[PDB]
Symmetry: C2
């Protein structure tokens, strides 16, 4: 069933588990995410970036929303990283039930004002919103989320869930080796901010996947993602929404590569896109196992 | 907007042009075909085989039907080569506005029975149907005066078939590597036969197994690391004449798969560091669009919207 992001995230934090927000850009990623959710009888969030918005267009948003209503598990359709008020309006227009306005690279007052404006529009149409305080960077101090400012930010904006900067970042190159997650800071934030918390750039980028990618011909540096244990503890401390994108992309590209390397003569797209879709699905299922959302529907 | 296959194919034959029935299996292919249709101000038919119904499932049929309603050109959603009555039921269920049941590999009597059953179901829900007749049955008792004349479709038989089944449009065997005539000789179009068929069957005619498969496309495919045998497709002029003689629907699929696959290869061969699907699927989607636009051009449907 299609529900708001908060209905899912509030329940999650209260019950101590995490729900995955998986980015999708077309039909098979969307199918993999939803089937994984159905097989795990687990709530899920379909994340569509502004990029997915441009690439997938009406077809993608039509799928995300309508297929969500038919899902037998709770599903929310989330705008990931809305960069403006107008971008958010188009998500509201496309039937999304959750939207993120990212202005963390702006100063406090601007971030507050921009986010508050989004909150009012969204709340007027029953959509819940995610905002971000702090800049997702490698490794109070630095520009990692400040606990007291998080409380203030949330009270002033009225946002529904907060993305926090506690050590993560986007990409396949999180850090050289196991990236450090400020779990102490997470707890302080959680103590003052009762809203469910959000973790961006949380892909695992497991070594075997990077390995399977290189073997198919892919080329990538010394990639590395957040450690499973860090994610498990982050969740226990308040993280209710974990974003995953990179992992899905690697698995998908890998399988496509193996298929084309091995079968010259294959030009039926279902033959190489199908197994790539399956792999994405398996990853989503693992992630749900990790987040503890299995049987949570 | 969304309309029946007959509304589109009837207008096409009466006005002398063909409408492409482009097979789609996912989002990219569907977007490519609809945008092509829009930029060419041309009607188009979205075709989904049973492989597509299985692979694309509810997601594909949802997109096909809904995006069709929003198109500025007339669009029909069609079940390509159904193999059973229930298959047709699932398509009627999914909102299709044109269904096709293929029992041409069956004897004339079973084909009639099977087709008539689909027609009754479809017409009960406002959906038009395509039927297929290949081999010479022998109904009125006809003797093949040629090895081909025994595999291809007999005009007279075609009339009776349509008269008994009540189908809306008909696919006929006239020389393309498809069905009984498959791998049984060099692909061609028995225009004389087509003309005789059209004289006795006023309903729009359908052409299967006919793909241009231009050398430039195969070249690009082979260059991308792909391997394919000596493809043999119908010549542009033939298609243009077949249409002039009554062909109103032209199934197109192979050419799309080739272009789509070739571009994915080029992008992956050249950018091994790439793992963002949009980076290699997007240009692939465009290639498909271009192929679709040329076919519409060849078929004569530009500006017929
Ligand atoms: Co993020
Ligand atoms: Co972020
Ligand atoms: Co056929
Ligand atoms: Na987000
Ligand atoms: Na057909």
């Amino acid at each position: 069933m299609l529900v708001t992001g908060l209905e899912i995230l509030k329940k999650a934090r209260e019950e101590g588990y995490g729900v995955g927000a998986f980015n999708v850009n077309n039909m098979e990623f969307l199918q993999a995410v939803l089937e994984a959710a159905e097989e795990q009888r687990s709530p899920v969030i379909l994340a569509l970036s502004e990029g997915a918005m441009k690439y997938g267009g009406r077809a993608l948003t039509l799928m995300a929303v309508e297929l969500a209503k038919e899902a037998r598990v709770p599903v929310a359709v989330h705008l990931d990283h809305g960069s403006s008020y107008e971008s958010v309006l188009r998500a509201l227009r496309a039937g999304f039930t959750s939207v993120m306005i990212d202005k963390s690279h702006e100063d406090f007052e601007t971030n507050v004002r921009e986010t508050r404006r989004v909150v009012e529009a969204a709340h007027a149409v029953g959509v819940t919103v995610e905002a971000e305080l702090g800049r997702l960077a490698g490794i109070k101090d630095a520009l990692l989320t400040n606990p007291e400012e998080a409380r203030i930010f949330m009270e002033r904006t009225g946002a529904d869930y907060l993305a926090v900067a506690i050590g993560t970042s986007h990409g396949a190159y999180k850090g050289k080796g196991r990236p450090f997650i400020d779990h102490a800071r997470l707890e302080r934030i959680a103590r003052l901010v009762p809203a469910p918390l959000v973790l961006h750039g949380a892909s695992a980028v497991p070594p075997e996947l990077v390995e399977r990618f290189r073997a198919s011909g892919g080329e990538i540096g010394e990639a590395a993602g957040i450690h499973p244990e860090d994610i498990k503890k982050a969740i226990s401390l308040g993280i209710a929404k974990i974003n995953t994108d990179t992992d899905l992309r690697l698995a998908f590209t890998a399988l496509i590569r193996e298929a084309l390397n091995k079968n010259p003569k294959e030009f039926d797209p279902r033959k190489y896109l199908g197994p790539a879709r399956e792999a994405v699905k398996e990853v989503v299922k693992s992630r749900m196992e990790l987040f503890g959302s299995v049987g949570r529907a």
